[PDB]
Structure 1
Amino acid sequence: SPGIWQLDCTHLEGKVILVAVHVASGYIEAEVIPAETGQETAYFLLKLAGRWPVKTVHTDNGSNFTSTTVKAACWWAGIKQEDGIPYNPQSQGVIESMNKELKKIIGQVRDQAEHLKTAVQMAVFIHNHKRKGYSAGERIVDIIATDIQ
C-alpha cells in the first residue's frame, strides 16, 4: 500500500482533468489535457513514476487498461497496471467525493487564474496541504519513509 495509486478522470469546462490518487494518503497529482487518450495517460504515468515510487496503478477505465501505450509506459516505469473495479464499494464514493471537492476548490480559485491549468494546480496544492491533524502531503511522505526504513 505505500506504492498503490488510482487514476481518476473528471471533466470541467469541456476539458479533462486527469488525477492520480495515492490511495493510502489521499495525496494527488493532476493535469489538464484536451482529451483522455492512451498517449496522454501514459505520459502522465511516466511523470508520476519518476516522482514517487509507484508500484501499482489502478486505471480509471477499461480503455486505459486496454491501451497498449498505457501498458508500454507501465512496463517502462516498472508499474503493475491493474483494473479499477471497486471491489470495495467505498472506493466509488471516495473518488466521487474527491472530484466534488476538487471542483469546489477550482471554483473558489477560478477567478485568480486565466487558464484552467493554473486553477487545477492551485486546487492540487490546497488539497494536498489541507489538514484533516496531518495533511495528505505529510501522510504520503510518512507512509513511504516508514516503508523505506
Structure 2
Amino acid sequence: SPGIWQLDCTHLEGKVILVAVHVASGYIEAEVIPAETGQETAYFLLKLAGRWPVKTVHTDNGSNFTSTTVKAACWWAGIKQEDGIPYNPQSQGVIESMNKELKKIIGQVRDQAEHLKTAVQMAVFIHNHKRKGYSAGERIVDIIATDIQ
C-alpha cells in the first residue's frame, strides 16, 4: 500500500495531462504530453519510479496495460503493472473528482504562465502542499518512512 500508484489521463487545451496518484496519500506527479502514447507513459513511469518506491501501478486504460513499451519500462523499473479496474466503485468518482480539482487549480493559476505545463506544475505544487491537518506531501513521506522502518 505504501508502493501503490494510480495512473490517470485527462485532457485540456487539446493536450494530455498524465497524472500518477499515490493512492494512500493523494500525492501526485503530473506532466503535459501531446498525446498519450505507450512511449510517453513508459517514460513517465521510469521517472516516477526513480523518485519514489513504486511497487504497483494501476494503469489508466487497456492500451497502456497492453503496451509492450509500458511493460518493458515496468520490468526495467521493478514495477508490478496492474489493471485500473475499480473493483472498488468509489475509485471512478475519486479520480473524476481529482481531475476536476486539478483543472480548477489550473484555471486559478492559468494566467500566471504562457505554457500549459507551467500551470500544471503550479497546480501539482498547490495540490501537494494543501493542508486538509496534514498535506499530501506530508502523508506520502510519513506513509513510506513508516514502511522503511
What do residues 73-109 of structure 1 show as CA deviations (whole Å, max 9, x unaligned)?
A: 0000000000000000000011000000000000000
TM-score (norm 2): 1.00
SS of alignment partner, residue 84 of structure 1: coil
Stretches of 4+ moved more than 4 A in 1? none
Output the CA distance in 1 between the equivalents of 2:97 and 2:122. Answer: 18
Q: How does 1:16-95 map to 2 (within 5 A)?
A: 16-95=16-95
Count the aligned residue pairs. 149
TM-score (norm 1): 1.00
Output the CA distance in 2 between the equivalents of 1:129 and 1:104. Answer: 16
Displacement of 1:15 after TM fit? 0.1
Displacement of 1:114 after TM fit? 0.5
Pairwise CA RMSD: 0.2
Displacement of 1:111 after TM fit? 0.2
Displacement of 1:126 after TM fit? 0.2
What do residues 39-67 of structure 1 show as CA deviations (whole Å, max 9, x unaligned)?
A: 00000000000000000000000000000
Output the CA distance in 2 between the equivalents of 1:73 and 1:36. Answer: 15
* Residue of structure 1 in register with 2:8 after alignment: 8
SS of alignment partner, residue 94 of structure 1: helix
Displacement of 1:37 after TM fit? 0.1
Displacement of 1:70 after TM fit? 0.1
Displacement of 1:9 after TM fit? 0.0
SS of alignment partner, residue 28 of structure 2: strand
Displacement of 1:132 after TM fit? 0.4
The share of aligned pairs that are identical, in percent, is 100
Displacement of 1:69 after TM fit? 0.2
Q: Which runs of 5+ in 2 are unaligned?
A: none
SS of alignment partner, residue 133 of structure 1: coil
